[PDB]
């Protein structure tokens, strides 16, 4: 056990076994200021959980999806990503490709929603 | 390779947010506007970039220390009736404390609206302005009315911890040579900061936190003479205050339920209020400051310490609060030396009762007299210097801006926003 | 056996939370700080432990009734000009109401700042303190200024329902023999409480809720004489008030837009204000109280009711409000009897206009005169007794602490926190 | 229909028929008193949903796990728990074993998260 | 791309392909006004997410359920519902029966939650 953000400097493979530690800490003059800090924490948490549900990843911490990895985003191989890079370094590399990936996941699930809707119709 | 979404990745961005107070007789920065406290996690291989000069905790703490100050002064007496004409005579009519006082007699309202009250009080010459037994008036009377410093609230600073809300983290730089800027090899995630005492002072960082290994020089741009230099000591320099007088506080009923506390009489040791700094300890502390200050200007340069240039009494003097009474010490014997490649220093301090604290106009405060003798023991844990725009560099004491006082305590802390949603390639494929 | 997680289990823990008001001419406890209402579910086989003496609804309702009181007094007249010197003469110069009054003449401010106003008013002797046609002054003038009870807000208590937020439930004890503590066999979950009228009174619980089958004795520790005894009747004892005088309210303009309502003249029936309690009904009600009170002290013990010991007029008298004017009745003929193993009782009541209601100092209130004759019909639904520290037990009336008045209405209610996440063994196994 | 907390006195078997009755009732300066109670209910609800999500139980009132029932927590047989006890009695018996069970459920899910993530790449 | 509420006039079949657009727009003196509106937006969002959870539809935008259509709620066939009407016209038609269906979906899931629960015990 490392603690909150303990694996920030750890490799992506090693830091992915402690996702629960960071996940559980995202939810919980000194009056309204302290009260609006709690409402901001809930709204920030709820819009992240909404994104997971839209991508079909609701209730999951590691969600393998159907969107293929465009090599333009990152040409590195798996060995030097999950064993040589940390999540802070990785976020810097793909910070500009984040929004195009988000749209790809959003539409891919929307296609899967109608694909399973038609399969159940038979 | 396929995109796989990871939720909860240890990724953070720089952010500005509202940190809530936490703390462990009412106070100005009371515990009724804070939260009880309860911690530190070492983030290995993490090298974060800090910037103590564009830190928003410093800007927020300034707002909150001000806000708790005003919030603590509203419920107690406003001294509008104290703008009357004062018939002031000298107290001594001849070096002492009594040469700093005027014995001022005035008509005051009674608890009954139709009755007056011929009373008198000893006002410092710094609080009364002559009108042209002469006729005087209180100094902050053409600008505002002075809400009396409420007698049951203490000015003693209690440590306050600024704690980040959910979704945010406070990064603490554990590097011992970290000036104020650039990468910090050793970082930690604290739930929230150490107890930061909001000690309000100028030209000298009384109390607070020491450096770890050596005197630290911290300037936003050391080559710019318009930027203050925040020196931080490694060994504190103890400074002893005093007001030797045995003051006699006197109560005047200026209205129904409202009382005005006045200096009725002054007896006892009438030596001027002063602060003592050990001459040997201060000399070796400036020696350490000079040694760490030649690293930015040269080995052969001449480091000269002069005294404050000019301006308000709050900026030309070591203004501070001690025992509920506000001092304004000269500190011209502290900063008087030229450095080439049992004894004590006594700093004459004046005292005021009408305080415009946060460099503002229109909101004064009348600090009531403190009964008895006031004694003081503080640690000088830092300096605020300004450089003069040749082989000689002259460093005058600085200040005025209260943010540089708390910038010296929040230099190691940083607030980040956790970004827990990250995507990365993997051999997965959704079934 | 494997762990299976159930979400939504009917499990609750004791909790303290903020219950919000609900209610179904502005009022002190107005509907503008409450919510419209709309319910009760019987929880079979549930035996919960209640404690009316460590109930936080009582402590919160005390804060809220105070808070709505002050919030209703800020927007109306503050009587700072009423601290002048009063030249007061007797009204009768000889048993009547007029022997309780002083005819006080004073200089008052006009709506124009530079003009005065020679006015007079009839002040009760309980509101004026002599200064040494003599010279007097209002009683709460060296302690505070009296914000005038605003004439358009009524003091009549409207029922307020305290409703629990989401995630909490209010448990209601339906047991009819439930004293105040221990298991309650019959429990119910109400959305929120019955309409609790915040009737403010001492020594007698005017109006409110009756017992179901028999007079209930409720003490935190019946063997401790320092604890008040909350008697609750099963049949109400009707008490009739009156101020027979035909008062004449008079308006004085003390400033721009501010008016001071004064008693200009008093005519009509000048008998002292009094309350009538039926002598037969009160005797049989004390008989029921004594019968239920010998169960805790013995069958052969002597139950004696004496009158209030001493202290403030608010604690030695049945202080209450009726018709907007505040009464202070003796109740020494009510509690005067010794019990061994058409007619009426008249209680002489005084009246005050300057009220320090919530046992506080520094916040008074001037209740303006009520035009006309005041008449009153209330139910005595309880008592607050104190026991004297021998075969004779003496029970004096008590009070002072306003929380014991609302502790008698919130004794059956309890706030719990729902814990909907529970784990239990089952033959399941996740696939 | 018994209503909110109606089955509080029913046996654990019968009280489980009505988990949705209590579930829907957990969610819905004088303004701040009401406003701060609303925020407390939201963040109290979200912390329970977050716990279910990290155990692989999100969106389920009854969730089956892969954590065997250690008899140290309670050795009573299945017949004397679901037909003799009420949920209030049960909560008092396993109150001290609650936190150790919570850790096991969290450790059981992230083990299944990685095992399914690994098996999905084959 | 049409935008938020852009498919309001589109037929029900065409407007059901843009659910992610409306879903992500439901979450994001004079200080309580801003703050109390935010708390009410979070509370309303959680009420609709709770309903989807107790129907078995958590994390889904299109959720095919086991509740049969009575034809007493609407006698129109699929051709004239998904190709002629819009979601606003449809909403005004089954507004009377909305709470009837909302009760059937909850009851069906609760029965289905235990039939699957009893199936794992074998
Ligand atoms: C207090 O008020 C009194 C009057 O109430 C002041 O005495 C007056 O002073 C003026 C000169 O400014 C004379 O012309 C009057 O005759 C005085 N009236 C008296 C003595 O009854 C007195 O100066 C005031 N004291 C102050 C302002 O300190
Ligand atoms: C309030 O009065 C003070 C005192 O007269 C004013 O300060 C003086 O200003 C003049 C003009 O610049 C200087 O010569 C004096 O030396 C000042 N006295 C002190 C004690 O500083 C002040 O300007 C006035 N404020 C306002 C708003 O009118
Ligand atoms: C620096 O800290 C010292 C120690 O806390 C302060 O001195 C204390 O002040 C309080 C209140 O006046 C006294 O009750 C203590 O007895 C004092 N301690 C000692 C050792 O004298 C001092 O006031 C602080 N300096 C400031 C606030 O400028
Ligand atoms: C602060 O100390 C300085 C130095 O002691 C005082 O000012 C100077 O004092 C020296 C000799 O002590 C004189 O030669 C200078 O002419 C003084 N300069 C002045 C008076 O401007 C000073 O008086 C002390 N106090 C303050 C408030 O500055
Ligand atoms: C109202 O004010 C008048 C003055 O405006 C008071 O009358 C004065 O009373 C004093 C005695 O206290 C006399 O010495 C003055 O000569 C009086 N002045 C007159 C009559 O013009 C009067 O007593 C006040 N009334 C009150 C306080 O009730
Ligand atoms: C305000 O004045 C009243 C009246 O003079 C004070 O109450 C009196 O106190 C003395 C001294 O204990 C008693 O002998 C009197 O019987 C009291 N009078 C009444 C009517 O109670 C009161 O103490 C004063 N308050 C303050 C804060 O000074
Ligand atoms: C107890 O309740 C009675 C009945 O509500 C109150 O008497 C009423 O008071 C209002 C306002 O003064 C009148 O409009 C009603 O006509 C009264 N009713 C009757 C039957 O007289 C009484 O004031 C309450 N007792 C208190 C508040 O102490
Ligand atoms: C309240 O009633 C009592 C009793 O009637 C009054 O006080 C006593 O009255 C009896 C005779 O009626 C006297 O023998 C006592 O000496 C009285 N005790 C006193 C005056 O202390 C009392 O006056 C009434 N009013 C109050 C406010 O107590
Ligand atoms: C830091 O890196 C070392 C190896 O470079 C590794 O052993 C260690 O686990 C890393 N720190 C953390 C917190 O994982
Ligand atoms: C991959 O990214 C490039 C831009 O970086 C883009 O032009 C290309 O269309 C993308 N390929 C796919 C399959 O999305
Ligand atoms: C009062 O003191 C001042 C300064 O000490 C002095 O200038 C003045 O002459 C004194 N007034 C007297 C002695 O009357
Ligand atoms: C502070 O230290 C960092 C790292 O050593 C350095 O890059 C920076 O220049 C220093 N600050 C100044 C003002 O030079
Ligand atoms: C300061 O030192 C002087 C002598 O140098 C002494 O008389 C005085 O009492 C000292 N004051 C304090 C506060 O130490
Ligand atoms: C300050 O006072 C302390 C005792 O309160 C004394 O031990 C110390 O020597 C003093 N130091 C100076 C510099 O006056
Ligand atoms: C600085 O010292 C000089 C003399 O050395 C003095 O004239 C001046 O007033 C001082 N300035 C201050 C104390 O601000
Ligand atoms: C000054 O610091 C020392 C330790 O460096 C401490 O023992 C002493 O109490 C401090 N004096 C104060 C805070 O007055
Ligand atoms: C006024 O009344 C009081 C009490 O009733 C009495 O003591 C006083 O003598 C009266 N003053 C007169 C009659 O002048
Ligand atoms: C109130 O009743 C309960 C149950 O009968 C009993 O245990 C308790 O002792 C009673 N209260 C007192 C103060 O005796
Ligand atoms: C109280 O009773 C008396 C006679 O005993 C009567 O004169 C009076 O009017 C009654 N007052 C009330 C309010 O009932
Ligand atoms: C009180 O007054 C009512 C009428 O208002 C009357 O019927 C009743 O008999 C009176 N009771 C007493 C005890 O005065
Ligand atoms: C209680 O009654 C006695 C006489 O019986 C009286 O002296 C005393 O003042 C009364 N106390 C009160 C009414 O508070
Ligand atoms: C007193 O209670 C009775 C019923 O017990 C009720 O009819 C009557 O109106 C009440 N009187 C009041 C509240 O004044
Ligand atoms: C209470 O227990 C009885 C049998 O002991 C049972 O029939 C009844 O359903 C229980 N109450 C509830 C609300 O389930
Ligand atoms: C059950 O818990 C006990 C601790 O009370 C532990 O010693 C035992 O090993 C556990 N049984 C298992 C893990 O099978
Ligand atoms: C409006 O209706 C026309 C055909 O009637 C259709 O082509 C168009 O897409 C509709 N508008 C939207 C926004 O879908
Ligand atoms: C349709 O609803 C009606 C009541 O509106 C009901 O009687 C009927 O049974 C329902 N149809 C089916 C198939 O359940």
Residue numbers in the entry:
A (entry chain F), D (entry chain D), E (entry chain B): 519 to 546, 570 to 663
B (entry chain E), C (entry chain C): 34 to 57, 65 to 78, 82 to 137, 148 to 185, 188 to 309, 312 to 323, 323A, 324 to 397, ...
What does the paper say about this structure?
Broadly neutralizing antibodies (bNAbs) targeting the HIV-1 envelope protein (Env) inform vaccine design, hold potential for therapy and prevention, and advance efforts toward achieving a functional cure. On the HIV-1 Env trimer, bNAbs recognize highly conserved epitopes essential for viral entry. One such epitope is a V3 glycan site located at the base of the V3 loop. Here, we report on the identification and detailed characterization of the new anti-HIV-1 bNAb 007 targeting a N332gp120 glycan-independent V3 epitope of the Env trimer.
